[PDB]
């Protein structure tokens, strides 16, 4: 009856930038998703491919908690088939998504007067990010023909831009922490079940 340590994911004191989103494996465990779904802290609980009411009924081989911090106006980019600068460039979900997305406002945790520049996002990369891919590489984005030897300038923009997370920003610009539960079941025995 070892309950799943969702506290180390949802209640973590320091989340990760959306480009370098953390991924925690959950298995050898029992997880009650009804507590998360019936929690008032979460502003968004969008389940794709499954239904949250039946989450405790099903079992999967393992769960992946993909934790990051995005902008409010940007939370709608964590749905399957969405496009933009987070979905296409930072964290892509396949249209055949079997999981859930859990977004809660975290202004009082990840904002700072003057800007919480500790959170970043990837404006620049060659191709759209493959679903469930992350790229932590900070390589100068050559947008032009001329190789410029890795100096930040025209057609050599730094690929990562910072998030301006101030407590006075409008809700669409406030830091929302997002945890994506990706559910995987296969020939390996279903190990993470729900009460």
């Amino acid at each position, epitope marked *: 009856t070892n309950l799943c340590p969702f506290g180390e994911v949802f209640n973590a004191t320091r989340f990760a930038s959306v480009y370098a989103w953390n991924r925690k494996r959950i298995s050898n465990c029992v997880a009650d998703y009804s507590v998360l779904y019936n929690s*008032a802290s979460f*502003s*968004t609980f969008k389940c794709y491919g499954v239904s949250p009411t039946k989450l405790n009924d099903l079992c999967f081989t393992n769960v992946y908690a993909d934790s990051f911090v995005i902008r409010g106006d940007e939370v709608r980019q964590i749905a399957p088939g969405q496009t933009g600068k987070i979905a296409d460039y930072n964290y892509k979900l396949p249209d055949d998504f079997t999981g859930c997305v859990i977004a809660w406002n975290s202004n009082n945790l990840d904002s700072k007067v003057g800007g919480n520049y500790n959170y970043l996002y990837r404006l620049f990369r060659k191709s759209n990010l493959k679903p469930f891919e992350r790229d932590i590489s900070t390589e100068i984005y050559q947008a032009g023909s001329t190789p410029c030897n890795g100096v930040e300038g025209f057609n050599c923009y730094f690929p990562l831009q910072s998030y301006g997370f101030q407590p006075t920003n409008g*809700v*669409g610009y406030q830091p929302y922490r997002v945890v994506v539960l990706s559910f995987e079941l296969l020939h390996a025995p279903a190990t993470v079940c729900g009460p």
Partner: single-chain antibody
Amino acid sequence: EVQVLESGGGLVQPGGSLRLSCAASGFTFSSYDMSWVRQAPGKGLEWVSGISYSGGSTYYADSVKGRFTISRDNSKNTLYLQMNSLRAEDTAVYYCARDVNFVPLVTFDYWGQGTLVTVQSVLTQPPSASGTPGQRVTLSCTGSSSNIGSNSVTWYQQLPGTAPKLLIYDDNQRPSGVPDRFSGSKSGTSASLAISGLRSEDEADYYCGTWDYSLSAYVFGGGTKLTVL
């Protein structure tokens, strides 16, 4: 198809009760917030109430606070509004609107057809605005720092005799199906919509809707019947 049917509207009497039920299919009804919105005959939209994804948090307009109960049964994926101790001002048409995003950035995309129930606006949107074909008309919403400044401004175009349709969300963007002609704008505590070039299909009522972190309600705009000359 993300259609949301709705029923339970008919002739009732003041001081009675009425159960409105709307059933949503084609999407995970138990994951999206929903709401009940009201339109008096020949009057702007008035947001009745709203219930979260879990059904735990419920929000009500202060004009209907304390007498309407919004409820949600996810097993049958249906959603109910229990109207109790009705008044004469509640005779209107009711819609249940799917909320694309969390609160406060409320975004009502899909709306019910409308149930005819027979028994002031915070956002001081102009009563009307006259335009001409090919013109660039800016119809400007107006609110406080709690209405416009902090939460997303969403613009709905209601054709005469139809359910409202989302045009602008998150103050800038457009849905998949809205021409780029419409452009959102927001500055401080004042939002606006810019229509560059007008046609015969832009004859509609345009409403600005924003959540409130203080009033805890999704206030709508007033009218602004755009007329093409």
